Amino acid sequence: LLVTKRDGSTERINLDKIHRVLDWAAEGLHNVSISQVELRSHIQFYDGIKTSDIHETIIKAAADLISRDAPDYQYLAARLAIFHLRKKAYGQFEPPALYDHVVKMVEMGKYDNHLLEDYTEEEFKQMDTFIDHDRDMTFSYAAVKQLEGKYLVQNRVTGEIYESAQFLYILVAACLFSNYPRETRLQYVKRFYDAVSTFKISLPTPIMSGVRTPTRQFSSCVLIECGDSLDSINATSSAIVKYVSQRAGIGINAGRIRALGSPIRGGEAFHTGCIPFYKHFQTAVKSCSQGGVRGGAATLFYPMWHLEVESLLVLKNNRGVEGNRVRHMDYGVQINKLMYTRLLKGEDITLFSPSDVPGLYDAFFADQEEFERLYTKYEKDDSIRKQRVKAVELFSLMMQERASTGRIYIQNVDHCNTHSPFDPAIAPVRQSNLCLEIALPTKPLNDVNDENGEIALCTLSAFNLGAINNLDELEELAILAVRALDALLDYQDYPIPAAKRGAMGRRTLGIGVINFAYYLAKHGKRYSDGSANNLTHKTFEAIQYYLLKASNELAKEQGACPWFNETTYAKGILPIDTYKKDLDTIANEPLHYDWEALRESIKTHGLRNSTLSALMPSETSSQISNATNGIEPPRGYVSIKASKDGILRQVVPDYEHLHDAYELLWEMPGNDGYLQLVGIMQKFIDQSISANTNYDPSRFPSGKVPMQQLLKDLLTAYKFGVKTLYYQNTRD
């Protein structure tokens, strides 16, 4: 029988070629079986079978053997897949020189031509000495499939993979610091390459996927505010379409659109409602969501007191006509203290159209006192179209639609401005993003190119808490991370002018953490019992302090962000002042760093970035370092995660030693322990946290999850100053 080699030629089938490869990939690994992989492949030999198909089959086989009893298959399947991906891009295992590769790739239009304009052949060959291609042997299988599937530069019609993993890292370092002075450029390029290639710093999907490619868009989060006009709705739709085709996820703020039945031009027209426009925002996203790095999505936000709110909460549920369903978007309900007050007192909540209540909308975010004044005043006004709903019923509907769909999110808008890095009078936060961790100021647009509008962009990265051995290493990491992201803002392109205006005036960054569950496991702490409270406070104080200190030193070198005066940092206010005081009853850990000296340096030199910290889910990017995604506890010791090919198995880091220290997601008795940690983190985080609420129906009497618990947990979340609530996971 004959096999078909990679180069087209054919030779006699020889199983020793397969034994060699598998013996290589299993060397050093414990409790793996060459025989298992070959037999579980069920590889069907036929005359002329391609040798490439043979290898992909034994990769799948070795990848599905990942288990608790045999964790090391995560590296057997990774080493096989790296070997496969090496041949796919180079025709051999040995990667070429960095210069010879970039020349060929820039010539193919797969890289940005600026790489040859900014770096010389003598400089490229110097960065090839930085590269350690053996670091490809430290990936897990889930990491390699995300590289092959999303991150590595590839053709989306051919399937042709073009680069290696270490070339991706080194060129992301080269491009982001390409605009740096020669005296420290390659110095930083090496130091930042080492930081990300050894998993000290996690980089998000658009940076991994795009930084070195011609099309320059690398901000994960795009926040568009929509006004109550067709010119703004048109501008919003156009901006969504532009940025969704650019590896971005959208957050839409359509709370201003007047309710159904409202007069248009004094009664020349009858407003058909918000839902016909929400359908337009959905098709805007879906028109070009897929086809690129991944399928983009969007979350739409509206205030709880909106008149159509009872119809907007049910938009994702199946039971209804297509005319009243906009299913394929997520929604964030905006709530403030007054709304919760109506629930606690069993009173009603009056629903208004924002067009009938002047200044009520802006007060809902910027001025909590002024809102209560206007609200009760308009509640008594009989000339204003209103609608009263029992707060107990409105909350039940929302939490019920949050439960069944899982994608009805909550944003406490008053916390996002009372404890924010922005002056609500000058630049209030009126919105969040796709995953509910970004809170940045916005102003709606009049045209696609309205110079006076503002679209909020946030660029992300994460600290690998498992990778550090001492919290002071963050000082060095925060410098490398902030510098790389800030120079990225000047390096990338902006398809919408109003988006460039926000990104350049505020220079907002969103750096978070991954491997937090493994971090608690290394410290022998847990989510639910409350043993991580003081540790969490100590950990995230160091993160925010060293992040501010890094951007404050960067503000000295290149000047603070243009709109820094609009921030609360400019007025000398730190997170340690505006945090929710209820946190003092769940954490007695003291501050350890000189915050008052940092307050003075910020008062004087400013901050290069208006925001720095935000805890994102890192659903995909954390898999690169095999880290537990964000702050969420892993679902199991071997977790099942999704990919474009299929299912992926991911072992928790250091399983053999720490399988007892881990508290798995469904081993948690409730959300009170977790929610307290989110509140403690929020004491220092500039923006928000993609906090999940989890419920196991079997843990409840009669197997039904009580509405009492859904509401009691939502209140305990607000009590500790949680800004937003993301997923609600329900077991089975």
Binding site: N31, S33, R40, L344, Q400, S702, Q708, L715
Partner: protein
Amino acid sequence: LPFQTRSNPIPWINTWLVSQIDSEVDTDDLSNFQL
């Protein structure tokens, strides 16, 4: 034992050798709470 400790090199042989939400709400219980 004459040989080194080793994991089972053919684990597959062991196959053959051994053969909806409670809607009720209590606002008074929720009122026992300060935001």
